[PDB]
Amino acid sequence: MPNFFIDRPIFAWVIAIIIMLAGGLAILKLPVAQYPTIAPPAVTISASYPGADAKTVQDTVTQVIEQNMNGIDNLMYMSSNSDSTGTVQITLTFESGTDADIAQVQVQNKLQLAMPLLPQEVQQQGVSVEKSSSSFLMVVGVINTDGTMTQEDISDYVAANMKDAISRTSGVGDVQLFGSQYAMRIWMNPNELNKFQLTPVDVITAIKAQNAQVAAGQLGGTPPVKGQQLNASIIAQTRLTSTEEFGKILLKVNQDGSRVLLRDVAKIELGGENYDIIAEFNGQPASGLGIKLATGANALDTAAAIRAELAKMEPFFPSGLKIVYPYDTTPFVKISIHEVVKTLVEAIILVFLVMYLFLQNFRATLIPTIAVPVVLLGTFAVLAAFGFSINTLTMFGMVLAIGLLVDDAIVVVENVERVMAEEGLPPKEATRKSMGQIQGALVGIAMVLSAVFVPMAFFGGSTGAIYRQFSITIVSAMALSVLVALILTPALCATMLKPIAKGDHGEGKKGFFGWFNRMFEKSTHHYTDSVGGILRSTGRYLVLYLIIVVGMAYLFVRLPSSFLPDEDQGVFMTMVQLPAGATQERTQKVLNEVTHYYLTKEKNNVESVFAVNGFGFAGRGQNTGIAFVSLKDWADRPGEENKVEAITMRATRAFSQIKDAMVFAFNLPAIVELGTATGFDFELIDQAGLGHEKLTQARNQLLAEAAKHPDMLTSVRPNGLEDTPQFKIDIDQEKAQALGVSINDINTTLGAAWGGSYVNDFIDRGRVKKVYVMSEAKYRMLPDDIGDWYVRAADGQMVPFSAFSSSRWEYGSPRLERYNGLPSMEILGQAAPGKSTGEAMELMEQLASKLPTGVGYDWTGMSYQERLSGNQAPSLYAISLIVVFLCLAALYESWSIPFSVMLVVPLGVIGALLAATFRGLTNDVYFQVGLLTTIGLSAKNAILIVEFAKDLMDKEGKGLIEATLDAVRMRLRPILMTSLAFILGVMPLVGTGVMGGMVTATVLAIFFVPVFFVVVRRRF
């Protein structure tokens, strides 16, 4: 085939132009984001029940919906929370590979049929269903600095004038408002209600009657009295639009014609739907939007358009209203794309320098400059053809792929110039010569390298999704580089290289290159002499080979092993937890001192503190909170002591002296869709209707046994909230019936005054908003306020709650978890230092076996995933080596010669093993794929050397040691050229020994490869 395109250089140009046009169109059409979708599809059902405790939520909503989640396909597990905020969430997690559209429609369709089974208040509130496994592109914060707008005002403005514009923006997929818009709040007064013999039932009845829309009909509608001239709609009532009109709602006409209006027994003002969250941004009132990138979109274009539209809106923007961007993922996208172009142009500069230093002509330095960008552009086409996006994983894969594409380029040009200098052939006849020498090895290298990278793409779940990005990027760039090296570079050498006289090695030219040429020739003969000597004492170097492979196994096992470490992202969280019964004000004081710490003692690192009151990591409530701390870029806080790893520990130790609170700073994960991957996620399950307290006791027994094993388990804790005092109030049914009081009036008065009640909607400047009734705060704080509410009896007399109720304190759970339909408790932990998380998990299974009867367990989250990927590892690694061996045996026509190459490649890997040792790197997926790339690259060196060795023995009938020496002589310059390009490339990143490790990664190959070729063919 290369013969074909050398006689047809313009056909090959046509093919390279097609590849460039496809790659350009691919870059224009290609989606771009930080990470691809790795998390398995998760659909979350959310509902609200105002005034409700955790078990009313569970006993009327959660269990009912969970019982109707049948018939849905491809479900892995379902978990759900019911807390004392009236909030329930049910997350159904599906198998990786299942259509998230079909998954969500099936879930909501079952929920729809279950809706008539829910309480009438829950149906009124409405039930939402979202895809929860997608994460935010950025978070636009909207804060007020002049101290004139409350958070309710900011969020109302953002919904009215910002949100829908942001959603209509191109690329935006979903926008979530971090707050509630205005709501017509009715703050009743029990003393005024009692003064007029009124209850909240009357207030609600009047509101439903006077703030209603009423559909009459038509004036002169069909069927008419024919003769009729006019047809017109009849409109009776419509909604209200003002607080003033709500104040004039007539509740009662006194019998002397006097009016009792709603304003006379309640305060009326625009407020929030919800008052349990308090969001601040550096101590200022705050709100914002969480924006999600749409499907097939460009995060760079979308973020620009978002800041563009936010940039515009100033002709409408109120006083003190500022936009801030506490969280944004597109900087990391831009960094990973920039490092691809930085590596590409630095690659062509260095290969230009090295090609010229060895070959002393400019026309040879053009063939790599053309060939490399062609295949880099083709990779984008192949990525687009298969549905992949430009992300940090594929861009990492392209950066690693560049090193192999330049070696493919250098090998082909160098061998044709060696054939011209050794044999004195014209460029055309000599290029036929040279690819006839290397074409089979080139194809075999393609098979070998996909045998390395392809099999790891077949992990399941999250692990496979990450490996797929590297695999297709590297295998694509490798396969097209081979196709280009058999099509494009043959024609370019045959068409562009000058002839060379036989024997002209440039020893006779002058200046610097004359000195270099015979310096290199002298070293070339030194090298062949030394390898010739090594081939007499091969037992000695076989022993040295094993001395160094146990040395590599040692420093490899010693490295920290973490699949996806939580690197410094520029944002971290700090969790806040106060005791049972703690009020919102007490939480705010703690958060106030938390931001005061961050903005003073970490002045030079912290840029923003986004404090959230009422919402915790492990569970919501008045005694929970979390602060999102965003830091300045990596430049303006140099040194490792100013990274998140040390800031969090300084923050945690400083926060240990906080009285009456439990504060903890920690790093958010690299892939927030997954959450850590550090440790395990554990589910304790009531399998036999045991009850809450029994399950709590078992969890305590499990936690105690875990703490007794610090050599294996670290920080084993529940991911939930502990039981708290609650106010139990009993209605005497007999006393109620004897006084003529209905139970519905009693419960409606209690739940409306104290819990609040959603009545109906109204229209505020053309936007539909809700109407809530509730008591004033001062009349619904403490138990003695219960006796200030009166209820009307059938005889008209007003009775107070004290006459027919009794109260006591008891304990109950503010948060009830469920797993797969049964009551559960989520436990978190990680393995002790040095130990694997697999051992920690099997210790937990042991300790769980002796829990009380009727208590099961299960693994959820990414512990489910690691169980999956761990059972796949050995077969995948086994198939990789099996097919590698098979293709090499196909290349060399030998069941034995593959062992020569397979046994030498773990030597190039240790040029990076010590670099991780001196810098302090971690063994992760990024380091592992990098190890494979080095293994493949060094595997290309030995494959060519052994190919030339065998060809010389088979074609020319040369001796074994003669052919081996001739082979390593013909291959020394290209190996040192490629390695020289690499060492000069990483030198600007510089600790001298890291470069000195790469050099012996090369010197080990050039000596040991001939050793293994001779040792293997002797023994077989």
Ligand X SMILES: CC(=O)O[C@H]1C[C@@]2(C)[C@@H](C[C@@H](O)[C@H]3[C@@]4(C)CC[C@@H](O)[C@@H](C)[C@@H]4CC[C@@]32C)/C1=C(\CCC=C(C)C)C(=O)O
Ligand Y SMILES: CCCCCCCCCCCCCCCCCC
Sign of CA dihedral 27, 32, 34, 39: negative
The amino acid occupying position 282 is N
Say which entry of ligand LMT, ligand Y, ligand X, none residue 390 contacts (CB below 5 to 8 A, set by partner kind): ligand Y
3-class state of residue 713 by DSSP:
strand
Stretch near a second copy under the rule CB under 8 A, chosen from 55-63, 356-364, 729-737, 924-932? 55-63
Shortest reach from residue 304's CB to ligand X, in Å: 10
Beta strand pairing status for 138-144 and 798-800? unpaired
In the block, tokens 């773990």 appear at: 906
Q: Which is nearer to ligand CCCCCCCCCC, 451 or 485 (CB)?
A: 485
816: enclosing H helix or E strand: strand 815-819
User: Which residues pair with residue 845 across a beta bridge?
Assistant: none
Shortest reach from residue 881's CB to ligand X, in Å: 5
Q: What is the dihedral of CA 477, 483, 486, 489, to 10 degrees?
A: -50
Q: Which is nearer to ligand CCCCCCCCCC, 2 or 911 (CB)?
A: 2
Say which entry of ligand X, ligand Y, ligand CCCCCCCCCC, none residue 512 contacts (CB below 5 to 8 A, set by partner kind): none
Residue whose Cβ sits closest to ligand Y: 300
Under the binding rule (CB under 6 A), the answer on residue 980 touching ligand Y is: no
Contact 946, 897 (CB under 8 A): yes
Give the whole-angstrom CA distance, residue 104 versus residue 42: 9
User: Which residues pair with residue 627 across a beta bridge?
Assistant: 574, 611
Report DSSP state, residue 214.
-
Convert residues 874-903 into a mask of x (bound to ligand LMT by CB under 6 A) and - (unbound). -x---x---x---x--xx------------
578: enclosing H helix or E strand: none
Q: Which is nearer to ligand CCCCCCCCCC, 1 or 662 (CB)?
A: 1
Stretch near a second copy under the rule CB under 8 A, chosen from 127-135, 268-276, 443-451, 475-483? 127-135
Q: Which of 208, 259, 267, 338 binds ligand X (CB under 6 A)?
A: 338
Shortest reach from residue 333's CB to ligand X, in Å: 7
Contact 720, 618 (CB under 8 A): yes
Shortest reach from residue 5's CB to ligand CCCCCCCCCC, in Å: 7
Convert residues 418-447 into a mask of x (bound to ligand X by CB under 6 A) and - (unbound). ------------------------------
Q: Which of 31, 41, 378, 455 binds ligand LMT (CB under 6 A)?
A: 455
Residue 711 Cα to chain centre, angstroms: 31
Say which entry of ligand CCCCCCCCCC, ligand LMT, ligand X, none residue 891 contacts (CB below 5 to 8 A, set by partner kind): ligand LMT
Give the whole-angstrom CA distance, residue 20 versus residue 28: 12
Contact 321, 287 (CB under 8 A): no
Give the whole-angstrom CA distance, residue 135 versus residue 664: 24
Retrieve residue 205's tokens. Answer: 């009845």
Q: Which of 304, 447, 690, 712 binds ligand Y (CB under 6 A)?
A: 304
Span 466-485, contacts to ligand CCCCCCCCCC by CB under 6 A: 483
Give the whole-angstrom CA distance, residue 585 versus residue 576: 13
Q: Which is nearer to ligand X, 341 or 729 (CB)?
A: 341
Give the whole-angstrom CA distance, residue 151 versus residue 280: 8
Contact 125, 47 (CB under 8 A): yes
Nearest to 271 by CA among 749, 780, 778, 772: 772
Nearest to 772 by CA among 762, 780, 782: 762
9: enclosing H helix or E strand: helix 9-29
Q: Which of 64, 658, 668, 889 binds a second copy (CB under 8 A)?
A: 64
Span 130-169, contacts to a second copy by CB under 8 A: 130-131, 163-164, 167-168
**Cα atoms in the Cβ-side hemisphere of radius 13 Å centred on 817:** 22
Convert residues 555-584 into a mask of x (bound to ligand LMT by CB under 6 A) and - (unbound). ------------------------------
Q: Which of 20, 59, 694, 821 binds a second copy (CB under 8 A)?
A: 59
Convert residues 426-465 into a mask of x (bound to ligand CCCCCCCCCC by CB under 6 A) and - (unbound). ----------------------------------------
Span 193-232, contacts to ligand Y by CB under 6 A: none
3-state secondary structure 79-108: EEEEECCCEEEEEEEECCCCCHHHHHHHHH
By the 10 Å C-beta count (0-12 exposed, 13-18 middle, 19+ buried), 433 is classed as middle
Nearest to 53 by CA among 583, 726, 577: 726
C-beta atoms surrounding 883 within 10 Å: 17
The amino acid occupying position 808 is R
Under the binding rule (CB under 6 A), the answer on residue 543 touching ligand CCCCCCCCCC is: no
Shortest reach from residue 420's CB to ligand CCCCCCCCCC, in Å: 25
Under the binding rule (CB under 6 A), the answer on residue 871 touching ligand LMT is: yes
Shortest reach from residue 27's CB to ligand Y, in Å: 5
Contacts of 125 (CB under 8 A, 6+ apart): 47, 48, 49, 50, 758
Total residues interacting with ligand X, rule: CB under 6 A = 42
Q: Which of 485, 939, 952, 963 binds ligand X (CB under 6 A)?
A: 939
Give the whole-angstrom CA distance, residue 231 versus residue 222: 9
Shortest reach from residue 448's CB to ligand LMT, in Å: 8
Q: Which of 149, 278, 297, 376 binds ligand Y (CB under 6 A)?
A: 376
**Cα atoms in the Cβ-side hemisphere of radius 13 Å centred on 444:** 25
Under the binding rule (CB under 6 A), the answer on residue 398 touching ligand CCCCCCCCCC is: no
Contact 710, 815 (CB under 8 A): no
Under the binding rule (CB under 6 A), the answer on residue 458 touching ligand LMT is: yes
In the block, tokens 């990789």 appear at: 880
Under the binding rule (CB under 8 A), the answer on residue 10 touching a second copy is: no
Q: After which residues is the chain broken (C to N over 2.5 A)?
A: 990
Under the binding rule (CB under 6 A), the answer on residue 337 touching ligand Y is: yes
Say which entry of ligand CCCCCCCCCC, ligand Y, ligand LMT, none residue 443 contacts (CB below 5 to 8 A, set by partner kind): ligand LMT
Give the whole-angstrom CA distance, residue 705 versus residue 851: 10
Under the binding rule (CB under 6 A), the answer on residue 335 touching ligand Y is: no
Retrieve residue 628's tokens. Answer: 């999102």
Under the binding rule (CB under 6 A), the answer on residue 4 touching ligand CCCCCCCCCC is: yes
Under the binding rule (CB under 6 A), the answer on residue 32 touching ligand Y is: yes
Q: Which of 443, 658, 672, 798 binds ligand LMT (CB under 6 A)?
A: 443
Under the rule (CB under 6 A), what is the footprint of ligand LMT? 436, 440, 443-444, 447, 450-451, 454-455, 458, 871-872, 875, 879, 883, 887, 890-891, 951
Under the rule (CB under 6 A), what is the footprint of ligand Y? 27, 32, 298, 300-301, 304, 337, 340-341, 344, 373, 376-377, 390
Under the rule (CB under 6 A), what is the footprint of ligand CCCCCCCCCC? 1, 4, 483
Under the rule (CB under 8 A), what is the footprint of a second copy? 50-53, 56, 59-60, 63-64, 67, 70-71, 73, 84, 86, 101-102, 104-106, 108-109, 112-113, 115-120, 123-131, 163-164, 167-168, 172-175, 213, 215-217, 233, 235, 238-239, 292, 294-296, 760-761, 763, 766-768
